[PDB]
Paper text:
CypB is a peptidyl prolyl cis-trans-isomerase (PPIase) found in the endoplasmic reticulum (ER). CypB plays a significant role in the triple helix folding of collagen. It catalyzes the slow cistrans isomerization of multiple proline residues in the collagen chain. Here, we present the crystal structures of recombinantly produced wild-type and HC-mutant CypB from the horse.
Wild-type and HC CypB were crystallized using the same crystallization conditions in space group C2 with one molecule per asymmetric unit. While slightly weaker, electron density in this region was sufficient to unambiguously model the wild-type structure. The presence of two recombinantly added amino acids (Ala-Met) preceding the natural sequence in our constructs of both HC and normal CypB accounts for a partial stabilization of the N-terminal segment via charge/polar contacts of Ala(−1) with His133 of a neighbor molecule (a zinc ion coordinates this interaction) and hydrophobic environment for Met0 formed by residues Met68, Ala108 and Phe120 of the adjacent molecule. The conformations of N-terminal sequences are only partially populated as revealed by the difference map, therefore variable occupancies were allowed for residues ranging from Ala(−1) to Lys(5). Moreover, weak difference densities from Fo-Fc maps in the vicinity of Ala(−1) to Lys5 suggest that the structure might adopt alternate conformations in this region, but only one conformation could be modeled. The N-terminal sequences appear to be the most flexible, with refined B-factors higher than average. The recently reported crystal structure of human CypB complexed with the proline-rich P-domain of calmegin reveals that the binding involves the N-terminal region of cyclophilin and the surfaces of CypB and P-domain are complementary. The N-terminal region forms part of the P-domain binding interface, contributing several hydrogen bonds. Interactions of CypB with ERp72 and GRp94 also require the N-terminal tail as confirmed by NMR experiments with the strongest chemical shifts observed for residues Lys3, Lys4, Lys5, Lys8.
Residue numbers in the entry: -1 to 183
Write the structure that this text describes.
């Protein structure tokens, strides 16, 4: 079917992450971001990817990895889930819950309760519908899901911490000339 009525959100800008496990380069993940749907949340993520406020994601780690669930990163101040901050302050409100965690590869803000978005985020590796309405969804992996899967399956300890650090060796913004809708899947 042509699915005119099933068009999802528009990708308005992209972010890339070049990842490492230990000292091994493992490839690039490209995330499409929904700047019409959640502009404030997208703008934060993009600025943290460029580093333009003087802090951000470069060389931070994915400190929590749960196979068949998600990979979590963005704590560039403490690397352990205790830190991070947004470009608006330590915390900012949940912008909206228009988007759901539709399937593998959706990108959503980590939080410690209502209105506690900072810099931490997660990339789902399955549909995580139980987070719908609680975590703000703002992007989807468009390229390099296989690289996400490498992280997903890295050995972890009993605290779900990778045994070897998984780091964002490089990151930045990629402009999108014409925004484009993707499927909610
Ligand atoms: Zn080595
Ligand atoms: Zn939660």
């Amino acid at each position: 079917a042509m699915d005119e009525k099933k068009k999802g959100p528009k990708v308005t800008v992209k972010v890339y992450f070049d990842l490492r496990i230990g000292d091994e380069d493992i490839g690039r993940v490209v995330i499409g971001l929904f700047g019409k749907t959640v502009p404030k949340t997208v703008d934060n993520f993009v600025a943290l990817a460029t580093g333009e406020k003087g802090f951000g994601y470069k060389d931070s780690k994915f400190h929590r990895v749960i196979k068949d669930f998600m990979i979590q990163g963005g704590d560039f101040t403490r690397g352990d889930g205790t830190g991070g901050k947004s470009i608006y302050g330590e915390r900012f409100p949940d912008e909206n819950f228009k988007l759901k965690h539709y399937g593998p590869g959706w990108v959503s803000m980590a939080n410690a309760g209502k209105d506690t978005n900072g810099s931490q985020f997660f990339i789902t590796t399955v549909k995580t519908a139980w987070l719908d309405g609680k975590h703000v969804v703002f992007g989807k992996v468009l390229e390099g899901m296989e690289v996400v899967r490498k992280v997903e399956t890295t050995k972890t300890d009993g605290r779900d911490k990778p045994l070897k650090d998984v780091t964002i060796a490089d990151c930045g913004k990629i402009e999108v000339e014409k925004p484009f809708a993707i499927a909610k899947e």
